[PDB]
Write a protein that binds this ligand. Structure first.
Ligand SMILES: CC(=O)N[C@@H]1[C@@H](O[C@@H]2O[C@H](CO)[C@H](O)[C@H](O)[C@H]2O)[C@H](O)[C@@H](CO)O[C@H]1O
Length: 570
């Protein structure tokens, strides 16, 4: 079933019928005119270049016959170079969680999927660069507060109830030069939002089910890298605990973000929003928060009318929203982050109020497990504020962050950090964030605290706000110890791991996450494996995960049962 269409910037004529390679279309405007149907295909010729063009699709596939957008022929990825074209009217239909977040306006999107479901897009190169001749904003400054929002791929659910099955696979998205500031317009590489339906009684509550972003490479996109799920129904999630009933009715179900690479992201690299049990795995980010600094992020944003969303004449402090983390969830239920790498989340020293690789933000049941991080400008993990609850941070490896590993920034409830290995760079003399206050509780068990340096590190306060508990941790090369009745205290020169501090400082040449889930793997992380007679061996306690995540395995995929070793390796 369905019709295959062909488009060639090279060979095509828009007066052709576009249904054979011999008679292809010339411009994407021909596809934009169609109402697409189950089994339909849109094949862009390799070597093609669609300058000042865009795909704004209409129609929908079926579960058995999705629409496919893909390639034919041979040569370079077909290129969609939108250059500030592809205009459409974004309108959430009501203000967002902060009345200052912009929620209506004209947006430029290279690809727009608005109420298109059962669709798969693969193999394309996409840009939305501000640097060309006929660019609608001409020589407007890249960091003006009223620069138009820009997307590589924008998704909108609104007037078709639950949208099912949107797949973006192997897209190369670069030079999306969006608004430097705006968090919740479709503004950055890939951004999926949910708008208030015209008539919710008629079409049903708008939400997503089955959204797969996989094998994509993003470079120099702003503000967001990949964001999925910001919804008009944000006001249905204002409790600390998030019910399965709220999440299934209003939240994004079956969201998988996997095997993506991101470089030079202006703000946050990857964020799931209002998502029920999202899976975020095998992603690599480096050099994110590129524009979260006092040079780029330098112009004030308007105060918006709490009803109309129109500027009031008032302006915010330039610092508003001048924060970003690497790969993290917002108002998700039982989000799992596993097998990710995050390097150099930038700019905590020049106006980024955050800069952590990992941020268990407001939400319920976040589990970070079997992740690696290096050279981030803030602490390895933030637990953010009084609605960040039921947190598990386990079997992760962290080295050479520009702060100590822990940022419990006023988090609440059950917070468990266990079986991690933290390589703390020389001269930090702390395990805590340097300004967020460290007021929230943590239950700290079975962790390696490995202090690099020629002299023992000092830690002035092991128990800020009095609500830190410790059991069965290992402390290497530090001059004092917390209240841990089962502490393993280790002096400089006693080996604990094979080559502590020898984790990678850079992404793989092929930009893929280095797998470590089968313990027959030799990996670039093997310097964190325990030596024969390591003082970590058999010194941990059996963990009870009070968030309901049973202990299964270590960082490396070794089964864990009985009395565990201290740290990320069994
Ligand atoms: C509670 C808090 O302040 N969290 C910070 C995040 O800011 C929130 O982000 C959500 C995203 O959907 C909304 O924009 C909300 O209005 C913001 O309060 C922030 O994005 C992250 C990343 O730097 O850090 C937390 O500090």
């Amino acid at each position: 079933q369905g019709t295959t269409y062909y488009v060639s910037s090279s060979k095509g004529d828009d007066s052709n019928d576009g249904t054979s390679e011999s008679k292809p279309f010339k411009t994407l405007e021909k596809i934009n005119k169609l109402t697409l149907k189950p089994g339909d295909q849109v094949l862009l010729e390799k070597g093609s270049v669609f300058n000042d063009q865009y795909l704004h699709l209409k129609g929908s596939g079926s579960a058995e016959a999705p629409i496919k957008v893909s390639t034919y022929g041979e040569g370079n990825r077909p290129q969609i170079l939108t250059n500030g074209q592809g205009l459409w009217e974004l309108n959430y239909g009501k203000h967002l969680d902060n009345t200052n977040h912009k929620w209506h306006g004209t947006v430029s999107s290279s690809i727009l999927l608005k109420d298109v479901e059962y669709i798969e897009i693969e193999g394309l190169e996409i840009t939305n660069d501000r640097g060309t001749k006929n660019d609608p904003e001409g020589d407007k400054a890249y960091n003006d507060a009223d620069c138009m929002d820009r997307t590589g791929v924008a998704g909108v659910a609104k007037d078709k109830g639950t949208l099912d099955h949107i797949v973006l696979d192997d897209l190369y998205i670069h030079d999306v030069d969006g608004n430097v500031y705006n968090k919740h317009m479709t503004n950055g590489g890939i951004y999926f939002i949910v708008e208030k339906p015209t008539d919710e009684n008629k079409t049903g509550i708008a939400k997503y089910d089955d959204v797969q972003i996989k094998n994509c490479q993003l470079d120099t996109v702003n503000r967001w890298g990949i964001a999925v799920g910001y919804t008009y129904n944000w006001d249905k999630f204002q409790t600390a605990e998030l019910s399965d009933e709220v999440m299934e009715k209003y939240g994004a179900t079956n969201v998988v973000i996997e095997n993506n690479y991101l470089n030079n992201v202006g703000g946050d690299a990857i964020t799931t929003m209002y998502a029920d049990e999202p899976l975020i795995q095998y992603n690599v980010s480096e050099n994110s928060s590129k524009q979260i600094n006092k040079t780029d992020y330098s112009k004030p944003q308007p105060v918006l009318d709490k009803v109309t969303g129109e500027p009031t004449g008032q302006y915010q402090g330039v610092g508003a929203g001048r924060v970003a983390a690497g790969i993290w969830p917002w108002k998700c239920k039982n989000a799992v982050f596993q097998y990710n790498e995050c390097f150099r989340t930038l700019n905590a020293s020049n106006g980024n109020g955050d800069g952590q690789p990992w941020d268990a933000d407001y939400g319920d049941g976040t589990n970070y497990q079997y992740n690696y991080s290096h050279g981030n400008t803030a602490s390895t993990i933030m637990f953010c504020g009084y609605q960040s609850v039921n947190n598990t941070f386990r079997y992760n490896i962290s080295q050479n962050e520009d702060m100590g590993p822990l940022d419990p920034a006023g988090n609440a409830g059950n917070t468990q950090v266990y079986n991690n290995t933290f390589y703390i760079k020389e001269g930090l003399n702390n395990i805590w964030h340097t300004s967020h206050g460290n007021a929230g509780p943590i239950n700290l068990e079975n962790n390696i605290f490995y202090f690099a340096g020629e002299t023992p590190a000092t830690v002035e306060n092991w128990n800020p706000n009095g609500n830190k508990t410790y059991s069965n941790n290992l402390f290497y090369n530090v001059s004092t110890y917390p209240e841990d009745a089962n502490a393993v205290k280790v002096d400089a020169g006693t080996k604990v791991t094979e080559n502590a501090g020898s984790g990678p400082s850079t992404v793989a040449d092929d930009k893929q996450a280095r797998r470590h889930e089968d313990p027959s793997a030799e990996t670039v992380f093997d310097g964190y494996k325990l030596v024969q007679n390591s003082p970590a061996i058999n010194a941990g306690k059996i963990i009870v995960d009070n968030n309901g995540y049973k202990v299964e395995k270590d960082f490396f995929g070794n089964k864990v049962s009985g009395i565990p070793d201290i740290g990320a390796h069994e």
